[PDB]
Write a protein that binds this ligand. Sequence first.
Ligand SMILES: CN1CCN(c2nc3ccccc3s2)CC1
Ligand code: NI
Length: 341
Amino acid sequence: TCPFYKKIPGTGFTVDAFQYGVVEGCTAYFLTHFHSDHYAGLSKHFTFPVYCSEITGNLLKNKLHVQEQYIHPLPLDTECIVNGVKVVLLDANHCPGAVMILFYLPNGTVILHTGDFRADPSMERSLLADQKVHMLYLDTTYCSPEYTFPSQQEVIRFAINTAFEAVTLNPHALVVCGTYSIGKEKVFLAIADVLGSKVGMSQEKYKTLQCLNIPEINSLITTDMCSSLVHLLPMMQINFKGLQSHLKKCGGKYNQILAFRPTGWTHSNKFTRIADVIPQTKGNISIYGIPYSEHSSYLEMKRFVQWLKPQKIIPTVNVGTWKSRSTMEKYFREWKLEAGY
Ligand SMILES: CN1CCN(c2nc3ccccc3s2)CC1
Ligand code: NI
């Protein structure tokens, strides 16, 4: 059964609620983004209206084979009426196609649902500017002060400089990058750009990327592995065994692998600066864990919420334990007392 924090009161709407069968009273199902925990339950047999971004709709049609008659893409930054209620989709700064949803309820209440997001000061100059928001359904993934990590720009500078140095020292080195979902494409695109290569990948991953409206994508990616010196592999293969096995398949073209595992936050962020990050190495294979996050840091989350000044916050992540709920509630109250709302 569908939990309370996925229902929008005063409407027939749910958000990211496809794994609960027919939700009683639901006339429109919104999907914030194409990540499996959020789309869980969708398929070609789904027969209710789904509202989403254009990019999310391309993935629904081509990857999940949802019938076109049920896919309702909406443009961003545009007031739309859905089943008698005004809504707006805003860019979430998460993965491609990810949105936040503003709902203007018939009674005058305004609700913002962030979906998954990485809060940024640029959101302060979206259509949110000077918009009173009564209720905030908040991506609380990293809602504790220990969760620190660098900017995406800093992480990409590290990855580009590391890959360029390694391949310039050894032109027979291969670069490999792990993936298990959409998101974090800048990691492999930026490395391939500095090396003068297309990114090589499976047919299935190529299909996924073809759905993402990335400018000049045909110039950047390929299924011809032999033509490419930056390869994408499943995240599960980014280990010494998996990479040794891959190197064997490359027909003596390469004698070294440099691999990247984009993660979220890890406990080494409590000790080691991005500049000082070192790999794990065995023989001619080295593996870097890089903290490329598509969720708000604690500090980014706190700034956004203190700017927005919501009357009530409903967490959508870390909801399952009393300890995590109590921790989040304590921070919301600190933030409110500090800023005066
Ligand atoms: C059994 N543990 C319960 C507490 N835990 C977390 N609490 C929060 C709160 C806010 C952000 C993240 C977390 S993780 C870890 C698991
Ligand atoms: Ni997500």
